[PDB]
Amino acid sequence: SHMSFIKSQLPIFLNNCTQDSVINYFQNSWELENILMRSIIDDETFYINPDPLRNPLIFYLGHSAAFYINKLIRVELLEKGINSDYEILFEFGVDPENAEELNQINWPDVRQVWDYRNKAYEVILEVIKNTTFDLPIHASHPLWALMMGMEHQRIHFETSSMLLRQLPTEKVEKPQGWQYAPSQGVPNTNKMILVEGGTVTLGKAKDNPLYGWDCEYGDRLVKVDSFFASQYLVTNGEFLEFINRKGYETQSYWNEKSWQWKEENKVKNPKFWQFNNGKYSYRAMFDEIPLPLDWPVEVNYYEAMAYCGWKGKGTRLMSEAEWNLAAYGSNYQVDIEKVNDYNLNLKFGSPSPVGLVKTAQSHSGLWDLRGNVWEWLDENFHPLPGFEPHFLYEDNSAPFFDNNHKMMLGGAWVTQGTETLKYYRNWFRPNFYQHAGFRIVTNH
Numbered sequence: 214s215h216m217s218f219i220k221s222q223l224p225i226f227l228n229n230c231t232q233d234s235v236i237n238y239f240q241n242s243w244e245l246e247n248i249l250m251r252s253i254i255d256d257e258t259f260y261i262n263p264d265p266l267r268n269p270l271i272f273y274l275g276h277s278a279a280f281y282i283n284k285l286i287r288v289e290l291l292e293k294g295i296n297s298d299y300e301i302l303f304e305f306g307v308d309p310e311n312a313e314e315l316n317q318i319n320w321p322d323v324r325q326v327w328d329y330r331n332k333a334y335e336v337i338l339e340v341i342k343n344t345t346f347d348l349p350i351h352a353s354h355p356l357w358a359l360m361m362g363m364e365h366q367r368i369h370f371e372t373s374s375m376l377l378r379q380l381p382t383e384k385v386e387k388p389q390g391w392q393y394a395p396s397q398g399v400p401n402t403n404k405m406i407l408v409e410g411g412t413v414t415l416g417k418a419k420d421n422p423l424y425g426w427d428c429e430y431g432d433r434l435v436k437v438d439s440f441f442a443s444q445y446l447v448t449n450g451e452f453l454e455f456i457n458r459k460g461y462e463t464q465s466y467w468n469e470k471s472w473q474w475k476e477e478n479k480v481k482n483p484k485f486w487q488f489n490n491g492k493y494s495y496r497a498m499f500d501e502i503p504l505p506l507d508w509p510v511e512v513n514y515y516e517a518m519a520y521c522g523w524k525g526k527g528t529r530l531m532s533e534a535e536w537n538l539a540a541y542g543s544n545y546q547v548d549i550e551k552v553n554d555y556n557l558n559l560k561f562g563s564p565s566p567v568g569l570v571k572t573a574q575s576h577s578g579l580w581d582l583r584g585n586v587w588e589w590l591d592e593n594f595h596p597l598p599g600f601e602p603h604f605l606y607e608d609n610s611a612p613f614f615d616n617n618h619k620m621m622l623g624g625a626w627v628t629q630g631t632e633t634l635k636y637y638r639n640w641f642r643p644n645f646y647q648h649a650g651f652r653i654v655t656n657h
């Protein structure tokens with residue numbers, strides 16, 4: 214039916230974060246990332262940076278482990294680290310504007326970084342077993358460091374999965390039980406649905422009993438006018454029509470910045486398509502397969518907007534407030550079990566046909582607002598009123614309130630943890646590739 218053999222534990226309310234439940238959730242966070250890292254066949258592949266805007270894979274093998282250690286030291290739950298050189302080397306990731314910036318380090322051996330991981334795992338597990346979990350946990354409790362570490366690791370499962378997908382298939386091995394969604398399927402008609410206007414409140418209250426990142430908090434009331442939105446995410450088959458109507462070759466659908474990006478990278482189609490013998494194949498995590506015509510297309514923001522340009526007629530993307538209104542209405546009590554109703558949390562090992570998951574239609578009538586692939590939004594990443602950086606990670610989001618990052622919401626098939634729930638806010642530079650697609654909007 215769907216992926217079952219590789220299983221991801223649902224997140225836990227801070228009022229239920231018992232020592233036993235957290236041990237299980239920590240072990241699961243870490244085992245999942247181990248399964249992903251073990252899919253690289255040859256240790257020399259760890260010195261490749263398959264995405265030219267991100268670090269070599271060796272860095273991501275050590276990074277999630279160093280992050281836990283650094284934050285437990287900062288709250289004084291650990292009195293010393295495991296390797297101070299590695300805790301520096303693996304500390305900070307990257308967000309360059311171009312490949313040259315990043316290109317401009319002696320990495321350790323792969324076996325030395327696995328050793329570091331295994332030692333860190335045992336040190337953290339002992340902290341967990343030796344600390345009292347006085348419920349409830351909260352943002353001024355030292356164990357917030359541990360909750361932050363587990364979510365950071367699950368976020369890096371998702372962003373590392375995109376790096377492994379950019380390696381040649383011959384360099385990776387599919388883990389036992391990895392299961393893609395059914396792919397045969399021509400898409401259904403993608404109808405425009407009227408979403409009735411109303412008021413939404415964005416943000417998260419300080420004492421909400423769920424872990425979250427600083428940029429999730431605050432309070433913003435927004436009056437949202439009615440709008441039309443496509444009931445499905447734009448599919449591979451819809452986007453193939455744009456390609457066949459010279460979408461990548463027509464300047465008027467683009468703008469100068471996005472056209473420059475397209476030309477510089479010689480782009481003729483979405484990143485994970487290849488044209489051979491008269492037809493497109495598609496690169497799933499570990500295998501090439503015939504293009505799944507009814508799955509959501511995966512594009513960066515530039516490509517999403519070019520398709521909007523081809524549609525014409527004021528076609529555009531949703532704002533953050535518009536997505537929230539469509540997904541959650543005007544209400545809200547999170548029900549964590551509802552994550553099972555969407556293509557989230559490794560329900561599948563890939564995107565799914567739009568509409569296949571029959572529980573995934575929001576009350577507004579739109580399908581896969583939650584799950585399947587993130588959806589891009591026409592919204593510069595920005596703080597909500599009441600935003601405050603957290604002492605444990607002051608630079609988490611504030612550097613990126615710079616009008617150079619667009620938002621995306623709702624989670625993908627690969628998304629885990631509190632990132633699958635209502636409050637998480639995601640953001641990327643508009644040229645970046647994620648497990649991410651879009652739907653189209655018109656005012657009238």
Ligand SMILES: C[N+](C)(C)[C@@H](Cc1cnc[nH]1)C(=O)O
Pocket residue numbers: 306308365368369372638639640641
């Ligand atoms: C919020 N995104 C997903 C854009 C972040 C998450 C993150 C990882 N390590 C620190 N923050 C990113 O990938 O830079």
Ligand SMILES: [Cl-]
Pocket residue numbers: 546547548549551635
């Ligand atoms: Cl919910």
Ligand SMILES: [Fe+3]
Pocket residue numbers: 276306365369
């Ligand atoms: Fe990180």
Ligand code: NA
Pocket residue numbers: 581582583584585586587588622623624
């Ligand atoms: Na979505």
